């Protein structure tokens, strides 16, 4: 059917961290790769050390679930977004909020930072997404066009610069300056809750309960289907070397080969002691900056840190 996939080692659990008191809904690593940040449904934001998993600090500003966190490469700033409809900008030199972005009409669902300019994009449940200039507290643009809660937003430097996936099953590629849709992709059958961009291949993938799909920029033409993860997929995350992690809401995670669509591992983890098997779920993934380890943020209040297996070989774990 195609060339045979490259050999990809397996990944194995090596750390479990438990201190949150509600679902961990978001996770993000610092660009200098010494710490990471989780935001959770107990309304705190926790800063943990990436080497020893120690709790550095815990910030309690929000009013309801923290649903998106991101950390800024061009400043000591951290952007958070929650279900109280409010987006905050934390300053990491004081550990205090310094700015608050007003305007959304229902829960904010997630947010992204532009890699070059000083703009911020947030998607929400009023079926719209908004562009904020970092310093001016009022949306320079409100991208509208979706007919249901926008579940995900990603933004890149090349064109198009904004890809939003929502719950009316559609994906929309926007022009930032005109603030208008250039394309609507409607191959998905059920809601789109995860999209990801390949770091150096002008490609991007979009996950849905039917199957992950792969499309090509800047026009959004279908490439190849990735099928097998029959579950509400909450996260897609891609590695510098073509590993793609699809983490679903029934708790299972699948590792695939980005190129040939080959599902090369299935993890099915175990919930924490006091919890019901009905509360196993994966809400976010993240590789670190070395792309050596992979952090998972779960619906049983744990962070689970995976590592790569050195003791495997192609003959030990052969490729189907």
């Amino acid at each position: 059917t195609m060339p045979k996939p490259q050999w990809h080692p397996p990944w194995k659990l090596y750390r479990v961290i438990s201190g949150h008191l509600g679902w961990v809904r978001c996770i993000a690593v610092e660009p200098g790769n010494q710490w990471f940040v989780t935001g959770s449904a107990d309304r705190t934001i926790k800063i943990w050390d990436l080497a020893s998993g120690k709790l550095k600090l815990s910030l309690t500003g929000h009013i309801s679930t923290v649903r998106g966190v991101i950390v800024s490469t061009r400043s000591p700033y951290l952007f958070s977004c929650g279900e109280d409809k409010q987006v905050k900008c934390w300053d990491l030199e004081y550990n205090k909020v310094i700015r608050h972005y007003h305007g959304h009409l229902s829960a904010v669902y997630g947010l992204d930072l532009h890699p070059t300019i000083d703009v911020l994009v947030t998607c929400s449940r009023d079926s719209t997404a908004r562009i904020w200039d970092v310093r001016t507290k009022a949306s320079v643009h409100t991208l509208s066009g979706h007919t249901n809660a926008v579940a995900t937003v990603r933004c890149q430097a090349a064109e198009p610069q904004i890809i939003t996936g929502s719950h009316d099953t559609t994906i929309r590629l926007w022009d930032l300056v005109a603030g208008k849709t250039r394309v609507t992709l409607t191959n998905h059958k059920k809601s789109v809750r995860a999209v990801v961009l390949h770091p150096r291949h002008y490609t991007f993938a979009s996950g849905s309960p039917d199957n992950i799909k792969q499309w090509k920029f800047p026009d959004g033409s279908f490439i190849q289907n990735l099928s097998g993860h029959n579950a509400i997929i909450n996260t897609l995350t891609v590695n510098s070397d073509g590993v793609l992690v699809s983490g679903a809401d029934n708790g299972t995670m699948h590792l695939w080969d980005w190129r040939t669509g080959y599902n090369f591992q299935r993890v099915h983890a175990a919930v924490q002691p006091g919890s019901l098997d009905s509360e196993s779920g994966i809400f976010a993934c993240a590789f670190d900056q070395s792309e050596s380890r992979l952090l998972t943020a779960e619906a049983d209040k744990t962070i689970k840190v995976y590592r790569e297996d050195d003791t495997a070989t192609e003959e030990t774990h052969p490729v189907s």
Binding site: M2, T116, I117, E159, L176, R200, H201, Y202, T203
Partner: peptide
Amino acid sequence: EVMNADDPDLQRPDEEAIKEITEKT
């Protein structure tokens, strides 16, 4: 296609063009 068909076909736009778009935008 379902392959690694043309790697430079897929390759990303380049610094000059993305910086012109960066400044224009």
